[PDB]
């Protein structure tokens, strides 16, 4: 019958880990590098979208920055395709959390959440998992700024300076060296676009090869402001903090 | 507006001896003011050693009785044939009676037989499964007839010795299954009198070790 | 071999592997004998033990006052198939007040057989059973396999060895026929024919299970002391 | 059930509670706390038909409790209240709804704001410095128009609170054996056991 | 890869005969049934020294009048002993009575076979399932997971099974008292046990008309393993 | 739940020495209208069964085709259908009983009263009733809705009880049946002149007798009566 | 109906009338309106008969079911619950129950629940249930103390089931008593009131509207 | 036992010259009873104005699910809705409880932010949509609303006028209906300003 | 629905997924447990390979379950989520229905069932999870420690560890730790806890975390100071 056909993504390999997961992460690690990094008054997500060209759209374009509400952002890393069916899901349940308690929903109660869906496809359903990791940066009145990650085997974890994607191993250990506690945004944005300069595979480090993002409280007292950085904008903090 | 309920009338009778139980019911079958059968048979040997009949509505207490000599079946298949005791048969009985709580079985259920001591035995049910053994039970009908009269006559109730002027009761002596039959037969034959659905025939089923056996006796049949 | 994965594949030559595999195990099974007159029918079965501290496993099952079986293989599936034939027969009784005839009864158990060797996921019974019944046409005994073919016979046996009481009914087939009115000697007849398969071991008090069925008889099994008389 | 009443002080939230169960034809129980703690700083107090009362507010108690210790946080009193009224909304349309109303009152320890809502089973919420449910209020709102100030004191709020008890005691045709009642504050919940 | 309810060329379950593979790698239970009562034990076996070994439970109350012993893949039997105490207490519901121990075996039997592509395999663990009812008396009973059941005067289960029915073999008789039974268990086990047999490290257990089911204390079955020692010293 | 649109009215039926007779009138109607003059209501079952059905005609062809289809159903795989394993009335019956209560019991019953009238293999009479609420009896004398009051006193006159069934021939029970009918007719509002009449013997086995007539009608008396009381013209 | 529970010294007393009616026709003078859930538990049982006899029954399949899974005696409380759930879960449906579940636990100490098929569940010292509810209450409260030996505590409960069988047109029959202690419940008797009526007349000197 | 007149209320819109201006009570009672007198039944989502009389639990409830359905728009659409849109999203919203509905009667007001033209609609329970040039009213006090809007109001207000005009329609309606009053707030919108007005009124 | 069989026999008696799921389980971070006299403690690897992480937000180890019992564990992160919310649900229900918390003993039974039906359950995998469940019996001053594994068997443990080198620190809790005279006080306990994952974890920096769970549902989480005190007086006395 049908069994003859069936590849079981759900299963272990003798050593215990699960092949499809494995496999997924190494989809990932061919993806356009992501960075998000967190600061004392706000935080940084900066993206390179992969092998661009002049004829594609970039003013109306989006691969990488998505909002899940006002409060809540997330940068992609794998199949876009993938991302956006799981970046709705979340949407809803921040929708359904505004709703129930009539508060916005705490940036680690909406992780969990997106982490549990992708737990879900590892364990049972016999189908594949999502070739999709994020970097969800945050704020709540909590625990204030929040940066975490999630992957295909439904794990998170939080982060004061994290990358995914593309050469992370590299990424990492350059956010390592210059990353401190009581950094500034203007700096962190500084940091996160001098570390994309480094690590991509691509000549020479552009406006229209990125996509960046903050979300501070810079705006007006005490609320959050999410800016999605336009074309123009990229362009003039390249030249401002000297790559261009 | 359609009703799933009727009355076909009847009586029945179960009285516990010291060895022996009868169960005895009517054999007429009516609807509102006519006679569908003069001879419907109501009490049924449901095997085990066990009687049974089911009072009031006939649709629903011929699936019952249907639905319990089944189980009695069942029982057997289940459990290596092992004979079905007659508190056990109660029981079941009542689940089966509780399992249409919402829409019940409009009847009066009775069972007699012999207990595991080789006692007699008769075992009382209501329509939605409340169930208690009796030494005496009249259903159905005429039942407001019958019973003062067995409270009377069997356990002897109001009754004192004569000169001690009711400080002394009557003894309660046993009765043997010929004195049972008598009293029987006078409870119907006074039921027929003064119940328009009691009459045409009166058939007893008596339980003893020996097994089951069978008493016809006619009734007035206007 | 490459066609023996599951009940829904066919082999090169057109032959079902898995249904051959499940008739495998009712060689295996103890052996049984079924034999009837033209007023009784009668089952005989070789119980198996484990050891000598263990029971002898029950072979015969009643399905009715008129009917029942005997079972060699898997226990279980005789189980599932003897329920079912209970209720077949209760349903027949209570819907129509009619007994069930032992042919339609045979009829049913060939077309349950049937579904569990053209699906995929399930797979076929492992037992086969006689059933012997009286009716209103008289005595009846029955073979089942669980290829789906029911058979009706004078005698068989099946199980393990049962190649030799099978040629001593064919032998005796015109003798035991003629036994009417006379449970005893039909019984003594089905008690001789499985002892043509018997090795080593003999006939003894909780060994024998015999079984029987006709005009005034209703399905009554015997064991224990109660088949001392027929050793 | 009877009578519960609610109100809002400067730095805590009163409510009180009648203590009489009655079946029908007799008084069974004179001493009944009609009220759950949902969490430390947030108090449920329920009236309305039999079982569903306590059901409901067991129900609610149970996701509240859930709730923190998933999280290792205690919800505010508007989001706790959020939660109750979606929980009734959803309950009017259902083949058999709880037939149960509710007063919350809570210590929100982010503002430092005591904090009452009073939530009928319908569904309708709504803030209030004082409330009531059933008959209640009848009696008692015209005793608080008059009386109530946002910055009295939770002596002076006990005092306001034995006035409209009294008038109730005084007006209503019901025994209902007195009331008990419960301070939220900044510390979190305490019995007043002599009232 | 091939269907789980697959047939063997011999004619025998695969999965069935796999799961009854597991069942030797178990620790060892046995059980002796006389017409004083039917005893149970069993080896706890701890994989270290720093387990509490009272926590170690193979062997199960079913009802008052029903005991049961475990051997294999215990994790699998809670759902198997469950399903038998309903079936038990519900039994009693419907009427009125001790349900046969014949009964309750066969009604644990049947989930087996339940599985396919129901749960997803059979059951890997064997029970010794020992009580009374008035009909049959005392009982001992041998459930497997290929749904078959067999009754015992005595059984041995698990890793030392076949060295420990051989002994059995000899041992029975149909006059044997429950003190002699009890004595009895407690010496095969120690045979086939690798550890040294003591009270921590073995459980008894037995079935009485009169008291019930009992799971014996540690200084109960202490008293009888010093009772064997002095008894196999005698000559 | 529904109503009874187009209907039939009684059906009358007793046991002889030798058999059973049945009989049914040929008529359907439509409340006060008497609709439809040509309606058989006595449906054969095999060569030793009647089933006769009173009540909502549009049921009775349903339960007609159901009794069709259980003798189609009943050769399947039967080499004694015409024979040993043939259909017996006690058969057609309790599977027609099984129906009705099983329809009450949804409460969307048969709107019927339903008499199954045969003979059974070793010659025994069979003759039980059956309704939409289940109900079953059976007795010497049986009849459904105006029969009961009208037919079984003059039916129980000729068999009162078991014991007056051998002493009762064909010719005296089916005198009895036909005078029956034609007090029927004088009576009930709903009844028509033309009926059906089937015997059911253990010797000369089913007959089946159609197109029959209510006659020997009294009618002159009718002449003589004037008025409501006191007017003499 | 009638039917009570009280707490006190020495443990709960448990008494129970005996009638039972369908309409004005008086169908049963020897119902036991008690049942024995356990060694230590006990339910009454007033409303439908069916109801309360089927559930409680079932209840105490429930409760054996939990000390075999959780090695140790069942609560009031939890065995309580189990019977308020259940009806709550038919609420709306017709059951007709009003039952107190009674027993003594390590834990509780002896303890009363009034569990009710509209769903409700109060713990108590005291409740009287049924339609002679109310005569009972009136004796039992003027009488009540916690200092009551067993013997006076009982006769408190008989006499109080005596004052609502006179009055109460469906109670009657006998009395059953009950006594729960520590160590279980223990059963005292069926007292016919046709003959403890006199006696109780002559003896206590009650009852003089009555001529005997 | 009529839904729709157990806690009472009113709403009132206009159009005017290059605005519009959307008014209700603040009364929330149950029958006789008043409860509250801080109930708004007024929000907004973005530029987008909504008005909700009727049952109170559904007016809740349907703000809280309008919030929902506006905030997934707008991340979508990456846009804020329009008054003609959103107009349509409440009815499509009303229409599938066809046969089991909000007892509420909804009325939107806003200006179209790329054609600067106002925009007023009011709907029934169930969805229907009534488009008006001039005015809508809902709530309790229709009836009175209507007359004072059919005599008081006149095209082409000036927002200030325009305040005046509403501002007296929704006063002396309420003034005749015993469940609607307890104060009362004006919007007065603009297309890049909006003030909120409350009103001093009679207190019973 | 997907009803493929994953969990079977293999003709040695073997269910190889069950078993490869105690490899992931060898894989996970070292946990141990240990309970005194009047306590129970909990101590929890945390590998320092991950460093600018934010240990704010980062997930803890040890999660409570209720007020007075814990659960940690060894494995599969994402999966032992799943076991912790239906035995916080389980938790609350229990206390719903029977009004009585759980005891440490029938939480531990629950999550030993469900991951059991994930062995025997078709279309899923089973846990790759092994657990630690600690705590204190309602109105119990009783110490107790339970373990489960992903094939459902469970046991009660004098002390226990669990995960990456578990080998060694077992090793080392049977030597040092004496069931006639158990750690008396919280800090013997937690000192004891502290020496076995010393054999093992590398730095005593940021890569221990201990949990102190006493009766009464008195729960605390040490900060890294605490147990850095604890770290410098284990090597200053080892220096002799
Ligand atoms: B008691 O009065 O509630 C009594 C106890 C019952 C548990 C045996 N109930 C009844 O007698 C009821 C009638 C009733 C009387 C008064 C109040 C409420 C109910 N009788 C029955 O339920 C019943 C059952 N079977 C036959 C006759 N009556
Ligand atoms: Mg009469």
Same mark, same amino acid.
């Given at each position: ?244 | ?222 | ?231 | ?29 004179? @001493? ?5 703690? +949902? !969490? $430390?700083?947030?108090?449920? &107090? =329920? ?20 709730? @923190? ?5 205690? +919800? !505010? $009193?508007?989001?706790?209240? &959020? =939660? ?29 704001? $005591? ?81 | ?235 | ?233 | ?212 | ?204 | ?240």
């Amino acid at each position: 019958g049908s069994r003859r056909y069936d590849s079981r993504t759900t299963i272990f390999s003798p050593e215990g880990r699960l092949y499809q997961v494995e496999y997924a992460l190494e989809s990932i690690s061919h993806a356009g590098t992501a960075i998000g990094i967190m600061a004392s008054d706000g935080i940084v997500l900066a993206a390179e979208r992969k092998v661009t060209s002049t004829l594609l759209e970039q003013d109306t374009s989006t691969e990488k920055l998505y909002k899940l509400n006002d409060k809540i952002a997330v940068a992609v890393a794998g199949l876009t395709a993938d991302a956006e069916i799981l970046i709705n899901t979340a949407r809803i349940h921040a929708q359904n959390y505004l709703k129930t308690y009539n508060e916005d929903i705490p940036v680690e109660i909406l992780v969990r959440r997106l982490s549990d869906i992708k737990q879900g496809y590892t364990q049972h359903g016999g189908l594949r998992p999502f070739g999709v990791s994020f970097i969800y940066a945050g704020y709540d009145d909590r625990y204030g700024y929040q940066l975490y990650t999630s992957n295909p085997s439904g794990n998170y974890t939080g982060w004061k300076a994290i990358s995914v994607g593309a050469n992370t191993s590299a990424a990492q250990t350059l956010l390592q060296m210059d990353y401190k506690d009581d950094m500034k945004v203007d700096d962190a944005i500084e940091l996160a676009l001098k570390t994309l300069s480094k690590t991509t595979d691509s000549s020479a480090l552009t406006y229209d090869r990125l996509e960046f993002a903050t979300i501070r409280k810079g705006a007006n007292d005490g609320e959050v402001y999410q800016k999605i950085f336009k074309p123009q904008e990229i362009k003039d903090i390249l030249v401002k903090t000297g790559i261009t | 507006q359609f009703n799933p309920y009727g009355d076909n009338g009847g009586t029945i009778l179960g009285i516990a001896g010291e060895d022996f139980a009868v169960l005895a019911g009517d054999t007429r079958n009516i609807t509102d003011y006519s006679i569908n059968s003069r001879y419907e048979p109501k009490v049924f040997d449901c095997g085990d050693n066990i009687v049974m009949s089911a009072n009031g509505f006939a649709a629903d207490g011929d699936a019952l009785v249907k639905r319990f000599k089944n189980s009695v079946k069942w029982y057997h298949f289940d459990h290596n044939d092992k004979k079905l005791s007659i508190n056990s048969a109660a029981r079941n009985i009542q689940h089966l009676l509780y399992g249409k709580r919402f829409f019940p079985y409009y009847v009066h259920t009775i069972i007699a037989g012999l207990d595991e001591d080789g006692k007699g035995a008769v075992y009382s049910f209501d329509p939605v499964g409340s169930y208690e053994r009796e030494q005496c039970r009249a259903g159905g009908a005429a039942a407001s007839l019958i019973m003062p009269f067995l409270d009377n006559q069997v356990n002897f109730k109001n009754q004192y010795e004569p000169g001690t002027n009711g400080k002394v009761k009557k003894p309660l002596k046993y009765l043997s299954v010929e004195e049972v039959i008598k009293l029987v037969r006078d409870s119907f034959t006074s039921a027929t009198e003064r119940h328009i659905q009691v009459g045409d025939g009166l058939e007893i089923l008596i339980v003893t070790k020996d097994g089951v056996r069978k008493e016809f006796y006619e009734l007035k049949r206007d | 071999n490459n066609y023996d994965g599951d009940t829904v594949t066919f082999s090169p030559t057109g032959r079902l592997f898995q249904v051959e595999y499940a008739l495998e195990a009712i060689k295996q099974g103890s052996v049984t004998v079924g034999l009837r007159s033209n007023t009784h029918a009668v089952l005989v079965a070789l119980k198996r033990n484990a050891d000598e501290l263990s029971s002898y496993q029950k072979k015969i099952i009643k399905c009715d006052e008129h009917m029942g079986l005997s079972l060699a293989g898997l226990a279980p599936d005789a189980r599932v198939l003897s329920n079912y034939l209970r209720q077949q027969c209760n349903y027949s009784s209570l819907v129509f007040n009619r007994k069930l005839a032992v042919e339609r009864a045979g009829h049913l158990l060939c077309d349950k057989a049937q579904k569990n060797t053209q699906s995929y996921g399930g797979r076929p019974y492992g037992v086969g059973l006689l059933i012997i019944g009286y009716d209103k046409s008289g005595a009846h005994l029955l073979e089942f396999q669980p290829s789906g073919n029911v058979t009706e016979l004078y005698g068989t046996a099946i199980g393990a060895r049962s190649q030799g009481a099978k040629t001593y009914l064919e032998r005796t087939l015109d003798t035991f026929i003629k036994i009417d009115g006379n449970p005893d000697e039909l019984i003594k007849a089905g008690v001789e024919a499985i002892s043509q398969s018997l090795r080593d071991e003999s006939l003894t008090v909780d060994n024998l299970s015999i079984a029987i069925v006709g005009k005034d008889t209703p399905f009554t099994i015997y064991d224990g002391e109660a088949v001392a008389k027929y050793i | 059930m009877d009578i519960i009443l609610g109100i809002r002080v400067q730095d805590s939230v009163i409510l009180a509670s009648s203590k009489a169960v009655t079946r029908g034809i007799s008084v069974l129980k004179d @001493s009944d706390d009609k009220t759950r703690q +949902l !969490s $430390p700083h947030t108090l449920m &107090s =329920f009236a309305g038909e039999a079982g569903d009362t306590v059901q409901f507010a067991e129900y609610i108690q149970a996701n509240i409790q859930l709730y @923190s210790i998933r999280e290792d946080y205690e +919800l !505010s $009193p508007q989001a706790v209240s &959020s =939660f109750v009224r979606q929980e009734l909304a959803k309950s009017i349309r259902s083949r058999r709804p709880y037939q149960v109303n509710v007063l919350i009152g809570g210590y929100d320890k982010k503002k430092n704001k $005591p904090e009452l809502y009073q939530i009928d089973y319908l569904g309708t919420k709504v803030e209030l410095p004082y409330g009531a449910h059933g008959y209640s209020g009848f009696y008692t709102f015209s005793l608080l128009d008059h009386h109530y100030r946002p910055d009295m004191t939770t002596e002076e709020g006990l005092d306001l609170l034995k006035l409209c008890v009294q008038e109730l005691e005084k007006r209503m045709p019901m025994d209902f054996k007195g009331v008990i009642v419960k301070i939220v504050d900044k510390d979190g919940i305490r019995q007043v056991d002599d009232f | 890869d091939r269907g789980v309810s697959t047939f063997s060329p011999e004619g025998r379950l695969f999965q069935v005969e796999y799961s009854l593979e597991a069942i030797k790698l178990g620790s060892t239970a046995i059980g002796i049934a006389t017409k004083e009562g039917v005893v149970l034990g069993v080896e706890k076996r701890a994989t270290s020294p720093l387990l509490e070994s009272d926590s170690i439970e193979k062997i199960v109350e079913i009802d008052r009048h029903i005991g049961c012993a475990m051997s294999g893949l215990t994790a699998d039997a809670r759902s198997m002993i469950e399903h038998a105490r309903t079936a038990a207490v519900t039994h009693n519901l419907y009427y009125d009575e001790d349900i046969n121990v014949e009964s309750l075996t066969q009604s644990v039997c049947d989930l087996a076979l339940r599985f396919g592509e129901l749960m997803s395999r059979p059951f890997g663990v064997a029970l010794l399932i020992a009580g009374h009812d008035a009909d049959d008396g005392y009982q001992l009973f041998h459930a497997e997971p290929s749904g078959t059941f067999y009754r015992y005067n005595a059984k041995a289960i698990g890793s030392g099974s076949e060295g420990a029915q051989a002994e059995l073999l000899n041992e029975w008789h149909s006059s044997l008292t429950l003190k002699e039974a009890e004595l009895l268990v407690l010496k095969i086990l120690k045979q086939v046990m690798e550890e040294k047999l003591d009270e921590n490290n073995a459980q008894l257990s037995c079935i009485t008309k009169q008291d019930g089911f009992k799971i014996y204390d540690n200084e109960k079955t202490a008293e009888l393993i010093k009772e064997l020692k002095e008894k196999e010293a005698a000559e | 739940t529904q109503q009874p649109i187009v209907t039939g009215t009684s059906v009358i039926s007793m046991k002889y020495d030798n058999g059973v007779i049945i009989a049914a009138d040929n008529l359907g109607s439509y409340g006060s209208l008497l609709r439809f003059n040509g309606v058989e209501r006595l449906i054969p079952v095999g060569d030793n069964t009647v089933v006769g059905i009173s009540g909502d005609i549009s049921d009775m062809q349903h339960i007609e085709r159901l009794l069709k289809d259980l003798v189609t159903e009943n050769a399947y795989d039967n080499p004694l259908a015409d024979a040993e394993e043939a259909l017996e009335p006690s058969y057609i019956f309790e599977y027609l009983a099984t129906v009705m209560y099983q329809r009450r019991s949804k409460m969307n019953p048969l709107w019927n009263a339903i008499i199954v009238a045969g003979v059974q293999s070793n010659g025994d009479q069979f003759l039980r009733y059956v309704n939409l609420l289940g109900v079953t009896y059976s007795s010497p004398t049986l009849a459904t809705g105006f029969g009961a009051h009208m037919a079984n006193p003059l039916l129980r006159k000729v068999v009162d009880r078991e014991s007056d069934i051998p002493k009762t021939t064909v010719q005296v029970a089916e005198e009895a049946i036909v005078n029956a009918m034609r007090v029927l007719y004088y009576r009930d509002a709903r009844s028509s002149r033309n009926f059906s009449l089937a015997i059911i013997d253990k010797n000369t086995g089913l007959t089946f007798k159609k197109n029959l007539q209510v006659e020997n009608m009294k009618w002159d008396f009718a002449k003589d009566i004037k008025g409501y009381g006191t007017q003499k013209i | 109906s009638t039917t009570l529970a009280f707490r006190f010294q020495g443990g709960i007393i448990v008494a129970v009338d005996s009638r039972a009616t369908a309409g004005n026709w008086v169908a049963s003078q020897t119902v036991k309106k008690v049942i024995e859930i356990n060694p230590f538990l006990l339910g009454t049982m007033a409303g439908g008969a069916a109801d309360c006899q089927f559930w409680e029954t079932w209840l105490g399949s429930q409760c054996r079911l939990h000390e075999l899974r959780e090695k140790e005696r069942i609560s009031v409380a939890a065995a309580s619950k189990i019977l308020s759930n259940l009806v709550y879960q038919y609420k709306g449906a017709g059951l007709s129950m009003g039952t107190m579940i009674c027993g003594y636990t390590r834990k509780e100490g002896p303890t009363i629940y009034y569990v009710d098929s509209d769903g409700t569940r109060l713990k108590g010292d005291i409740f009287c249930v049924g339609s002679g509810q109310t005569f009972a209450y009136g004796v039992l409260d003027s009488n009540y103390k916690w200092d009551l030996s067993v013997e006076d505590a009982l006769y408190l409960g008989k006499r109080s089931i005596l004052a609502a069988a006179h009055r109460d047109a469906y109670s009657g029959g006998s009395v059953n008593l009950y006594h729960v202690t520590e160590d279980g419940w223990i059963y005292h008797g069926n007292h016919d009131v046709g003959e403890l009526f006199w006696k109780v007349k002559e003896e206590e000197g009650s009852f003089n509207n009555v001529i005997g | 036992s009529d839904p729709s007149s157990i806690n009472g209320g009113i709403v009132v819109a206009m159009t005017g010259k290059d605005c519009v201006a959307i008014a209700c009570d603040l009364r929330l009672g149950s029958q006789s009873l008043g409860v509250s007198n801080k109930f708004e039944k007024i929000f907004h989502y973005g530029h987008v104005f909504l008005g909700i009389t009727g049952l109170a639990t559904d007016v809740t409830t349907l703000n809280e699910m309008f919030r929902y359905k506006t905030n997934l728009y707008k991340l979508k659409e990456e846009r804020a809705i329009e008054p003609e849109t959103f107009t349509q999203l409440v009815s499509s919203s009303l229409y599938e409880r066809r046969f089991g509905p909000y007892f509420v009667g909804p009325v939107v007001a806003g200006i179209n932010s790329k054609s600067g033209k106002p925009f007023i609609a009011g709907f029934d329970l169930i969805g229907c949509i009534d488009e008006a040039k001039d005015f809508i009213v809902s709530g309790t006090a229709s009836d009175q609303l209507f007359g004072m809007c059919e005599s008081l109001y006149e095209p082409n207000l000036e927002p200030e006028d325009l305040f005046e005009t509403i501002s007296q329609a929704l006063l002396n309606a309420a003034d005749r209906d015993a469940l609607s009053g307890w104060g009362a707030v004006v919007y007065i919108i603009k297309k890049d300003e909006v003030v909120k007005r409350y009103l001093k009124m009679r207190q019973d | 629905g997907y009803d493929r069989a994953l969990s079977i026999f293999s003709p040695d008696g073997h269910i190889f997924q069950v078993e490869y799921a105690l490899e992931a389980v060898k894989r996970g971070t070292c946990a141990v447990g240990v309970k005194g006299k009047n306590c129970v403690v909990l101590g929890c690897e945390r590998r320092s390979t991950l460093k600018l992480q934010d240990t704010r937000i980062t997930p803890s180890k040890v999660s409570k379950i209720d007020s007075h019992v814990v659960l940690s564990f060894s494995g599969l992160n994402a999966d032992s989520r799943i076991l912790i919310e239906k035995a916080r649900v389980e938790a609350q229900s229990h206390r719903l229905t029977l009004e009585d918390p759980v005891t440490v003993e029938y939480l531990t039974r629950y999550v030993a069932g469900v991951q059991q039906r994930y062995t025997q359950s078709g279309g899923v995998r089973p846990f790759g999870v092994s657990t630690l469940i600690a705590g204190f019996d309602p109105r119990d001053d009783e110490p107790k420690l339970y373990q489960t594994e992903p094939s459902g068997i469970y046991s009660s443990w004098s002390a226990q560890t669990i995960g990456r080198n578990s080998k060694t620190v077992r090793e080392f809790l049977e030597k040092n730790y004496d069931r006639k005279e158990p750690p008396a006080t919280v800090e013997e306990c937690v000192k004891l806890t502290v020496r076995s994952l010393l054999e093992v974890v590398q730095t005593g920096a940021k890569n221990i975390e201990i949990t102190v769970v006493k009766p009464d549902s008195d729960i605390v989480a040490l900060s890294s100071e605490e147990i850095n005190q604890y770290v410098t007086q284990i090597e200053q006395e080892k220096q002799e």
